[PDB]
Each structure stands twice: as structure tokens, then as C-alpha cells.
Design a protein around this ligand. Structure first.
Ligand SMILES: COc1ccc(C(=O)n2c(C)c(Cc3cccc(O[C@@H](C)C(=O)O)c3)c3cc(OC(F)(F)F)ccc32)cc1
Ligand SMILES: COc1ccc(C(=O)n2c(C)c(Cc3cccc(O[C@@H](C)C(=O)O)c3)c3cc(OC(F)(F)F)ccc32)cc1
Ligand SMILES: *c1ccc([N+](=O)[O-])cc1C(=O)Nc1ccccc1
Ligand SMILES: *c1ccc([N+](=O)[O-])cc1C(=O)Nc1ccccc1
Lengths: 257, 250
């Protein structure tokens, strides 16, 4: 019945606002550059980077790498917080809860990071700054293509023009995957996701009526997601061996078996 | 006026049923009157108890954590129930969070009393009953965690409140306008001065010869907040004992 599926889309959109302070709605306000309320300092080269550290709160390529690292730790927390509010999730076997978070987090991060990107760069520092795609594309040996495949996915994914109320149901679907390695009761995860997909389906049809087969389009973006996850993971084990003086966070480490 | 407060009351009761599966009427039945739950009185019964019971997970650590998982489910039950309170969803979303952040513990200890008698607590959604003694008997850090919760339950249950009393009572807790960092207390206390009006009528209709039960219930709000502070400082102590799992129980 639609009334329950609509109700679920409201509940989900409500914690999503409550759990992620940097929404696509606020990111596109900033990114459109029409609003003078608070336009971002642009970091486009090494020099404006050093100028950036004066009026913006946050070698070079390393401290930026460790930057994403800290914001990833922080996103895992927000995603974790959002997960709890998905009906039925905290009722699952704790081992399955932990397993849905081990795998769903990366895919939600890049999904949410898309909100903060356009073809030319990414809002950094809670939107205070804008860091350029080509400046990120030009950092030292291995760092220069940490972020470029996230740009590619975002350009492709942002083409769907989802707003936050669609992303809310969709990132819930990502969390509730019954096909994650090592799950103990796949079936109750599948029952929740069944319902989330139902909610997402009516939501996509209502929020984007003329945009036909958006659901099918979106579901198929989760191929690009698992791909981007895997490039990042192996591209991370080079840096483990490139720089043994640089340290992965315990929390993110446990999300990388 | 009277019959709106009664409409408000039965709204809350009806909604509290949906949101809280094990109710005090349900609980009280198991504790004294078939469908009796497995009892954990010592170490021996516990190891057999996990074997036969349906639970998601050192012993004192395991019981402590089991209390954290239930806690997190309660937060979801209370959160789902809070959204049914007239006017709640329309408050500033920042204030909804603040009310829930602080009100959540006081609701948990209120509803935990429903599952407690002087001898122990109904556990495992009522499928078990863990004796109060066996929780006393836990290690110095863990053995005084749930004793004050029992102490409160004994006093609170002496009020002999039912689920329809508790429906309105727990709403009142959530719409407390003295929680730190509220941006717009006016509506919060407009809803509370409404919930209290209906709790007044409800108690007087349903406990007509229990004079000043309303006053007595509101003073028990004092004891709720002192238990929250007791429990908080107790976690201070045990934070001196020991990652994704930790991120869930923050
Ligand atoms: C899952 O939800 C979120 C997704 C992204 C963000 C976010 O602010 N990020 C930004 C702007 C970034 C981009 C960025 C670039 C340089 C420094 C950064 O750190 C600080 C200065 C910041 O800008 O937040 C951040 C980001 C990167 C991340 O790691 C990655 F996904 F790439 F593996 C994770 C989150 C990131 C926050 C929550
Ligand atoms: C709507 O509010 C509540 C919802 C559930 C419960 C509940 O079942 N609890 C029980 C039986 C308990 C007692 C208990 C003891 C040992 C193990 C427990 O975990 C399992 C058995 C369970 O989830 O019931 C639970 C409990 C404890 C809690 O944390 C505390 F408040 F004490 F800090 C919170 C909820 C608890 C109590 C109030
Ligand atoms: C973020 C911004 C820039 C770079 N870089 O120039 O290499 C890298 C990252 C990034 O994704 N860092 C990271 C490391 C470990 C775990 C999560 C994120
Ligand atoms: C529940 C049962 C037993 C113990 N113990 O013996 O230490 C503790 C608890 C408990 O309430 N744990 C808890 C921790 C943090 C937040 C809520 C509940």
C-alpha cells in the first residue's frame, strides 16, 4: 500500500537530514555560484592551497590524502548513525549489522560524495572550499588518481539528478544488501530491502514522473559503485607499501578486510 | 476540554501499543500468571540459557553489552513513538533530536520498570527472566549497574500504573522544555502543557482513589533524571576497562 511506502520515504528522509549535515541540497546551493550568501574559496594549484590554509579551516599530496581519511572516518559515523534509524536494522543479528556496515559504508560514501562533486571538482571543508579535479589529478605518483575515478562515477551518477529524498531510500537499500560476504541471516535483510526497494520505486516514480525507468537506471549504478570501491582498496595497499610512516585509521582499517 | 484529552489519551495509548511490542500488561502477566520464561539465577543457568534462548551478540561484559543492544532498539521504539505525539514532527528538527537525545534514557528506565519485579528483570523480549540477585552477583564494576534500576522500579511500580497511564506519561518526558540546547521551547511546552492536562484526567479517571498520583508521578521524574546521571557516571568508571561495533553503541 502506497501510504506505508510513502510513510517510509518520509521517515528515511527525516533521519537522512538529521544524520548528514552536508546534503546535496546545500551542496548544489553552494555549487551553483549564484548565491553570494557564502561562495567557497577555490584551491586550484599549490599556491592557492597555501593561501587556502589562512582563511579556511580544514608535503602536500599526503596531507590531502589524510584529509579524505579523516572525513571518511567522520562519514562512517554519520552513515552508522543513519543505519540505526532504518526500520528493522538494529533488530538484526549484531554480526550482520556489523557486516552490512563493513560493506555498505564505502558505497554510501562515494554515493554521498557525488553530491559534493561536479565535473570540475569537489566541495571540501563542509563546503568552505572547492578543490579542483585537475589539481587533485596532478598530485605525486600514486595520489593523482585517488579521486579521479570518484569524479568519473559522480559525473555519471549525478546525471540521474537525484535529490536528497531519493538518496535517502537508496543509501538505505545499499546498507540492506543480503549478498554481503559472511551474513548469518540473509533473509531478514532481504525482507527489509524488499520494502526499501518498494519505497524507492514509488519515490522515484513520484519525484521524477517524466523520468522513466530511473529506478532501473539507479539500481544499475551500483555496479559502478562496487568498481570504485575496489580500485580505491588496492590503490590504498600501494600507499601502505609506499609509505609505511603513514597510518590508516583503526575504524577504516576494520572496513577494509 | 475533557473529551479531547480523552481523544489525546487514546491516541497515545493506541500509538504506544504499535511502537512497544512487550507492554506492561503483557509483562505483568508473564511475571505472575502457560507461557513462563527460562530463568537465569547463576552462572550455570546462563550458559544453558544462551543455548536455548534467541539472543543477538567474559560473562559480565556480555550481559552489559546485551543491555546496550536492547537500549539501541528502545531508542528506535521511542523515536517511532515520539513521531506520533501530536505536534512533535512539526517541531524544529534540531529540537526533535535534542528532546529524543535526553528523553530517551528516562523513557528506557520507565519502560524497564515494567519488566522488573523485586526479584529480577524480564529479559530477551520476555523469553527469559534474569534474577536480580545474579546481576548483583556480577563483578564490582558490573554488579552495581542494574541495582539502582531495580531500586527505582520497585518504587515506581508501587504506583500501579498501566500502559494507558504510561502512554501519556512517557510523552510528557519527551516534551520536556528544559533539555540543553532547545531553539524553540514555546511549542514544546505547549504540547507538554497539553500532555500533562491529559495525564491529569487519565490518572484521575483511571486511578480515582489514588489521590495526588499526578504529583507522585511528576516527582518520579526527578528520580528518573538522577538515574540517568548515575548511569552516565557509571559508564565513566567502566570506560576504564577496555570499532565498527563501537560506532553503533555511541
Ligand atoms: C558518506 O558521506 C560523506 C561523504 C563525503 C563527505 C566529505 O565531506 N568528503 C569530502 C568533501 C571529500 C573530498 C576531500 C578532499 C580533500 C580533503 C578532504 O578532507 C577535508 C578537508 C574535507 O574537505 O572534508 C576531503 C571526501 C573524501 C572521502 O574519502 C573518499 F571517499 F574519497 F575515500 C570521504 C568524504 C569526503 C562527508 C560525508
Ligand atoms: C521501550 O523501552 C525499553 C525497551 C526495552 C527494554 C528491555 O528489554 N531491556 C531489558 C529487558 C534490560 C535488562 C537486560 C539485562 C540483561 C540483558 C539484556 O538484554 C537482552 C536480554 C534484551 O534485550 O532484553 C537486558 C534493559 C536494559 C537497558 O539498558 C539500561 F537502561 F539498563 F541501561 C535498556 C533496555 C532493556 C527496556 C525498555
Ligand atoms: C582524498 C583526497 C586526496 C587524495 N590523494 O591526493 O591521494 C586521496 C584521498 C583519499 O581517498 N584518502 C583516503 C585514504 C584512506 C581511506 C579513505 C580515504
Ligand atoms: C545491562 C545489564 C547488565 C549490566 N551490567 O551488569 O554491567 C549493564 C547493563 C546496561 O545497562 N548496559 C548499558 C550500557 C550503556 C548504555 C545502556 C546500557
Amino acid at each position: 500500500e502506497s501510504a506505508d511506502l510513502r510513510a517510509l520515504a518520509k521517515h528515511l528522509y527525516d533521519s537522512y537530514i538529521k544524520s548528514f549535515p552536508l546534503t546535496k541540497a546545500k551542496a548544489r546551493a553552494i555549487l551553483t555560484g549564484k548565491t553570494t550568501d557564502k561562495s567557497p574559496f577555490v584551491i586550484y594549484d599549490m599556491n592557492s592551497l597555501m593561501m587556502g590554509e589562512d582563511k579556511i579551516k580544514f608535503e602536500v599530496a599526503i596531507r590531502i590524502f589524510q584529509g579524505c581519511q579523516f572525513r571518511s572516518v567522520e562519514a562512517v559515523q554519520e552513515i552508522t548513525e543513519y543505519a540505526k534509524s532504518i526500520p528493522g536494522f538494529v533488530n538484526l543479528d549484531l554480526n550482520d549489522q556489523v557486516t552490512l556496515l563493513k560493506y555498505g559504508v564505502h558505497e554510501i560514501i562515494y554515493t554521498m560524495l557525488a553530491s559534493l562533486m561536479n565535473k570540475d571538482g569537489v566541495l571540501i571543508s563542509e563546503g568552505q572550499g572547492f578543490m579542483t579535479r585537475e589539481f587533485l589529478k596532478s598530485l605525486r605518483k600514486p595520489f593523482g588518481d585517488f579521486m579521479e575515478p570518484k569524479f568519473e562515477f559522480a559525473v555519471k551518477f549525478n546525471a540521474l539528478e537525484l535529490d536528497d529524498s531519493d538518496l535517502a531510500i537508496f543509501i538505505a537499500v545499499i546498507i540492506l544488501s543480503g549478498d554481503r560476504p559472511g551474513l548469518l541471516n540473509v533473509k531478514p535483510i532481504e525482507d527489509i530491502q524488499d520494502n526499501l526497494l518498494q519505497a524507492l520505486e514509488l519515490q522515484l516514480k513520484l519525484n521524477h514522473p517524466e523520468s522513466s525507468q530511473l529506478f532501473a537506471k539507479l539500481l544499475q549504478k551500483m555496479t559502478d559503485l562496487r568498481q570504485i570501491v575496489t580500485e580505491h582498496v588496492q590503490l590504498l595497499q600501494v600507499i601502505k607499501k609506499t609509505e609505511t610512516d603513514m597510518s590508516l585509521h583503526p575504524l577504516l582499517q576494520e572496513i577494509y578486510k
